[PDB]
Design a protein around this nucleic acid. Sequence first.
RNA 1: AGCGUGUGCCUACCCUACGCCGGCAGGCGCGGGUAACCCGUUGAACCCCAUUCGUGAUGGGGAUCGGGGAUUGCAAUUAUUCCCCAUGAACGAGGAAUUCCCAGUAAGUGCGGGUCAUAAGCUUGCGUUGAUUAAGUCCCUGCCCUUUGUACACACCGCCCGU
Lengths: 120, 77, 144, 191, 55
Amino acid sequence: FRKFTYRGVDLDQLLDMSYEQLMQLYSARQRRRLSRGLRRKQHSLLKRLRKAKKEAPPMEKPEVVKTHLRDMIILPEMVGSMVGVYNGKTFNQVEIKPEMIGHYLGEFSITYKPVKHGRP
Amino acid sequence: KVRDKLNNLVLFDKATYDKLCKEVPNYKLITPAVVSERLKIRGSLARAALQELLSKGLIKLVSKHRAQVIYTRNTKG
Amino acid sequence: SLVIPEKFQHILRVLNTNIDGRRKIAFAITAIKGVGRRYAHVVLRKADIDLTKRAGELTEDEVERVITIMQNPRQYKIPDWFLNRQKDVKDGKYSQVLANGLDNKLREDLERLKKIRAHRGLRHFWGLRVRGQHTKTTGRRGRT
Amino acid sequence: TPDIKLFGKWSTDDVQINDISLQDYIAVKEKYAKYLPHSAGRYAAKRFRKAQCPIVERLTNSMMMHGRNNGKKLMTVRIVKHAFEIIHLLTGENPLQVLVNAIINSGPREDSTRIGRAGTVRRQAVDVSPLRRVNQAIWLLCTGAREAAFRNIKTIAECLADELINAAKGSSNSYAIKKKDELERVAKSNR
Amino acid sequence: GHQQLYWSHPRKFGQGSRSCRVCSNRHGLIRKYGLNMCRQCFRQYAKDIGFIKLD
RNA sequence: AGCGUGUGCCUACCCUACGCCGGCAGGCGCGGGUAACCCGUUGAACCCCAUUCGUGAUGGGGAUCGGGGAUUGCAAUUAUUCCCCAUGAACGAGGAAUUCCCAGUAAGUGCGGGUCAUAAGCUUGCGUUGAUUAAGUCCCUGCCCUUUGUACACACCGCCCGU
């Protein structure tokens, strides 16, 4: 019943805004990342990643798209999306909640297993 | 082997003030350390009381330093 | 002056915590959880209260003004970079928290991380170090 | 006009040495009398060249120990000068005489040597050389003032001041006299 | 896209942008005064450069 | 104060005075040096003086942790680094044992070089302040020479007797 609010604005308000003010809506590192340059030199992968995310399955569970890019900052436009990101061995298929904003795909795929020691 | 955790008063009560005014100008060496030891008060409080007694003129200055100061009584003659 | 004044309040009951009155006012208010040494000098500089007095002889109007500076520090011209909690993920406001908002908001942030399932939240749930340091040689007081 | 080498404001003359065994090892009289307890150096080069050093300079050099105080000569010099101020204002006696009489009274005159293998407790009584008397006396005065001025409200300028006068009168409330006479007791216990 | 993904990796900066100019190894490089080799090659060829171990 | 270093071949990445903006980390147009000329008289630290503190896990100690802002790089998350405000744990001079040293020496204290796009708790140099003790011994751990003993010689960490 609770309605989520990020930085005083609503989810559809976050979708219908642009990067030029969204950099100030982000933190210090994410502003530096988005203000660094064009997503063309290596992030044509990111360009086609948001293209493949903008491909729209019908009104069901959306289709999972998987990628090797662990440096992808969650835009507000891709909330409620199904994605599995590579940790090196397999793909951890994760549901994008409306809380992901301000992080990476590497925040949500663990690499090391949690260790459980036995006998020395 | 008694601990006896000291609890020095931050300001003077009634008995400490006249005890100081009758006994401190009757001692040989006066430093804030020995005033805090004998009168169970704080170090800075002893410094403020000694500055007041210096301004009153009943204590002569010997040497001043950022570590400690040296005070003595008046000549009884 | 140096003689103890009348109604010299020894124990100060401020913001449901215990505050000694024998300490300096620039340092006796630092016993409150959330406020430290650096921000204490700014508060007693905005209010017209000198730093040369102990906390045990101040009275209701000056400590009430200091409590207003505690609760609402923004419109007493305290600069925005001096605060501990800035640019909130819930509402986006600049505020200073004094142990209650501080404790419950730290708890809410930790349960937010544990619910969001970030590896910072998983490391806080497991009880390990989060800032990315070596655990092989240190942290020997973890568990028996 | 150099009429007298006044040690800041104290006169290096009219000071009496009571022991004749320490006459040529304590140099404060009329030749090795300086205005400061800080000289240049080349004093620990040969074997017995430290016997010509001024006794207040030896006390100043032995004042600094325990890591965080090594090399701070100015700070130990001003401790020495302030301690001389309390010594002069406290007894009415010249402060150089108090230094001389304390070292004579705090000198251990008989020693026990560890003899045998490692672990066995055997002691053999020997007497102490007069230079080593002064040496352990200065070391004992310095460590007594050092452990008096530790985690205490009383400053080192006062803790050093009370330590010599208790050694000067032989009241045995000082720490140097305490180790001196337990060392004499151990040397007396097995001879 | 073999031509455009063969060596699209930037080796502009980093350790592997430079190498030993004697034997081409990437460990223990000496970059001071522009020698640009490892320590072993400098020790082996140090006499003809003019470096003498006088001190 | 003294050793230093400084625009590099593919190789792009140098050291910096000066002016403004901003608490700060930092940002822009401006001038020098390919070096005894410019940073630079390298206004370094420890020390010195003057306040505040007063034996209280305290204004000691800064580990752990939250939020925010800049720089480097194509890319920081398992925080590169730096800055700001909070958070203020253990630790009250350390058991058995063990390391280094004797004169500008130990020790305290900072500055250069190496790694370096971003970069020192390491290392190599440098400078400041500057001592206690001793001019000896073979007791311990070992070394050199002579004599003697040996069932050892892959050499006592050797060889060997019996239930």
